[PDB]
Write a protein that binds this ligand. Structure first.
Ligand SMILES: *[C@@H](C(=O)O)[C@H](O)C(=O)N[C@@H](CC(C)C)C(=O)NCCC(C)C
Length: 251
């Protein structure tokens, strides 16, 4: 394994790997970490560029994944992918894919032209139909996964998984001092705990002797380092290595 690795550069033909989405005022991170990583993997193991609908995951998985905008279980989301599959769907107001995201983007602890995020957003309905003008039908646009698994709390194994199969989904404990992240390798030094937050890990590296994980957040591009952040690697820091889930697309 190399000292550094960026999935964005290792797979130039898979643009989704470098895109950052916005969960809006909804606790749907569990669904985003998943559909983002899944999109990357569908592109990596079929070389087809397709943005998997976060809308489909968040609204149609049900209790098996948790409680919609109230939070969910990452590994459950990958399970739903292997059971029911996922349709395509782009960004809010994009009109791309079968089911585009229906929750408006917002400012996540930063100032901007967007409305501030307000954690109070309800889970949209599970509508099994594609937006008008889209083809094929909801049923026909389903992308299925052929396996759903959990990577061990092991740095080398997690690095190996990403190295061979692409980005994975993970989760960590967010503390108040993380909200203001801008650059460098994040390390929790103070602040109360805000709760668990699922994300997408697409690589690793070392910055001034400090090893880290290259992570993609779901709070838009004006947050952090263009939507991404780096976090201490090798110490299960604030749980970053304790909940790694991924899977493979059917061929
Ligand atoms: C993520 C978000 O910030 O939108 C969201 O809070 C979430 O999925 N939280 C869960 C923690 C996981 C990432 C480990 C969560 O709290 N859900 C588990 C409990 C639900 C009420 C079923």
């Amino acid at each position: 394994l190399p000292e550094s690795f960026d999935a964005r550069e290792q797979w130039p033909n898979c643009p989704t790997i470098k895109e950052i989405r916005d969960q809006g005022s909804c606790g749907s991170c569990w669904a985003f970490g998943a559909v983002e990583a899944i999109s990357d993997r569908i592109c990596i193991h079929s070389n087809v560029n397709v943005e998997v609908s976060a809308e489909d995951m968040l609204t149609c998985c049900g209790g098996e994944c948790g409680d919609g905008c109230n939070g969910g279980f990452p590994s459950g989301a990958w399970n739903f992918w292997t059971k029911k599959g996922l349709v395509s769907g782009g960004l809010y107001n994009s009109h791309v894919g079968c089911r585009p995201y229906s929750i408006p983007p917002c400012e996540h602890h930063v100032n901007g032209s967007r409305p501030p995020c307000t954690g109070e957003g309800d889970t949209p309905k599970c509508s099994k139909t594609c937006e008008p003008g889209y083809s094929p039908s909801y049923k026909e646009d389903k992308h299925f996964g052929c396996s759903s698994y959990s990577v061990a709390n092991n740095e080398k194994e997690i690095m190996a998984e990403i190295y061979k199969n692409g980005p994975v989904e993970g989760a960590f404990s967010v503390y108040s001092d993380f909200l203001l992240y801008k650059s460098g390798v994040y390390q929790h030094v103070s602040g109360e705990i805000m709760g668990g937050h699922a994300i997408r890990i697409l690589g690793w590296g070392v910055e001034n002797g400090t090893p880290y994980w290259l992570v993609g957040n779901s709070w838009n591009t004006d947050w952090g380092d263009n939507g991404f952040f780096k976090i201490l690697r090798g110490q299960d820091h604030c749980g970053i290595e304790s909940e790694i889930v991924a899977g493979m697309p059917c061929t």
